[PDB]
Structure 1
Amino acid sequence: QAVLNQPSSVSGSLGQRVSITCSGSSSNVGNGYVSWYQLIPGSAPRTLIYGDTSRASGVPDRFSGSRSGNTATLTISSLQAEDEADYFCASAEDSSSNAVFGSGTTLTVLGQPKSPPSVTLFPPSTEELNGNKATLVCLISDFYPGSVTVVWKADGSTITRNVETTRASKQSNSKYAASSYLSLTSSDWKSKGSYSCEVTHEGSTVTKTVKPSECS
């Protein structure tokens, strides 16, 4: 097919500026009509630039496009937390109806304040327990940077099976969220004295505990 080469990822500091390149040939980027798109997970693609330099309606002034030969550049100034996203260039090739997208770039914005995780641990419901199953749900939110490790415990000892933990994903406030699930039988739930969800973030651990016999 054809490839518009972008750096896999780039980073810039808060309030500062960053550039993302888009390298192709003379048959795509050389046509002098490059476009740029912003992708935030859980949201639809958003058009930033078209025709090398023209900003789409509603796009702030701090997004600017340029092109020198067969390499286009997206420049973002005054970086904010909400600019952390994936960015894709694009260009027609051999036809206005044959669009080619770039390999994509992930932008990180450094210098944001660290935020510890808020942790909420839910016990299994009575409804689920009547069907002889028990799911413990550990919801993890408002943490930055967007990486945590989760450890489950029963009566103080590490649980080594039937744990599933999601990846971290970005929230509407540019912090991260994640969740972890412990799948038990109703018998397991009642037998142990306690269960814990331990969430480690930047070397600091937050633990929530529930006690079956006292959960009601």
Structure 2
Amino acid sequence: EIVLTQSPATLSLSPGARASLSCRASQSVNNFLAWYQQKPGQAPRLLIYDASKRATGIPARFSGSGSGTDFTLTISSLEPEDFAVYYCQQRTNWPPLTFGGGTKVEIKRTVAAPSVFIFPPSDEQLKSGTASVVCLLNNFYPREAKVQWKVDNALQSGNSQESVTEQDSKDSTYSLSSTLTLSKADYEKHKVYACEVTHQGLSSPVTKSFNRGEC
């Protein structure tokens, strides 16, 4: 079939800067190519059709170009609203009318190290049979961050779930929670519980930890 490739998947740009977004087609779609914008919480919005034509009511800072196989969406100067996800779509008479995987445009800011907190499971929860251990990384940039859970110095794998906030509107940072869930029986079999955070703003991994049962 016809495959559309959007590389890079994340563009990190300063407010005000020029944004160039690429779309590559597995075979020639001529000029039958559309661009959409999608902001959080909303249906997508059509920006460009026939590779280079601006859709009605779309501001002049958006423009499309290319034909055949390679395509560019350009935003000549990002406004705050322009930091969202962009998708291309092939518009031929050959279904399916595939979308590319999307490119997210994010604010590029200076590196900011995470603050790390670890929360032991509550006594409330332990009465219920499960132990949740929460590790929090607060207000960091960039988004890439590795948290490795260690239980009595043993690396925990396939055992926790991460979750990440959208880029904050005030200071353009991210926050992340990692949650290790053991059953209460399994929890009481061990003593030292630790999450270990590596990030570009840290010269060395940060480790937060507690011994089960201590204040």
TM-score, length of structure 2 as denominator length: 0.69
Show the counterpart of 2:72. 73
Show the counterpart of 2:196. 198
Show the counterpart of 2:208. 208
Q: Once the 2 structures are TM-superposed, how far is the Cα of residue 149 of structure 1 from its aligned partner?
A: 1.8
* Aligned 8 A contact 2:18 2:78 in 1: yes
Q: Once the 2 structures are TM-superposed, how far is the Cα of residue 50 of structure 1 from its aligned partner?
A: 3.2
Q: Once the 2 structures are TM-superposed, how far is the Cα of residue 193 of structure 1 from its aligned partner?
A: 5.5
Q: Once the 2 structures are TM-superposed, how far is the Cα of residue 114 of structure 1 from its aligned partner?
A: 0.7
Show the counterpart of 1:140. 137
Give the gaps of 5 or more residues in structure 1.
Answer: none
Q: Once the 2 structures are TM-superposed, how far is the Cα of residue 165 of structure 1 from its aligned partner?
A: 4.1
Show the counterpart of 1:100. 97
C-alpha distance in structure 2 between counterparts of 1:133 and 1:119, whole Å: 23
Summarize the Cα distance change of 1:12–1:196 in structure 2 as closer, same or farther, 3 Å threshold: closer
* Aligned 8 A contact 1:86 1:104 in 2: no
Q: Secondary structure at the match of 1:166?
A: strand
Q: Once the 2 structures are TM-superposed, how far is the Cα of residue 180 of structure 1 from its aligned partner?
A: 1.9
Show the counterpart of 1:159. 154
Question: AA paired with 2:2?
Answer: A
Show the counterpart of 1:37. 36
Q: Does 1:184 align with 2:179?
A: no
Q: Does 1:18 align with 2:19?
A: yes
Q: Once the 2 structures are TM-superposed, how far is the Cα of residue 113 of structure 1 from its aligned partner?
A: 0.8
C-alpha distance in structure 2 between counterparts of 1:87 and 1:182, whole Å: 34
Question: AA paired with 2:177?
Answer: S
RMSD between superposed Cα atoms in Å: 3.7
Residue identity (%): 33
C-alpha distance in structure 2 between counterparts of 1:164 and 1:50, whole Å: 42
TM-score, length of structure 1 as denominator length: 0.69
* Aligned 8 A contact 1:133 1:185 in 2: yes
Q: Secondary structure at the match of 1:147?
A: coil
C-alpha distance in structure 2 between counterparts of 1:176 and 1:166, whole Å: 13
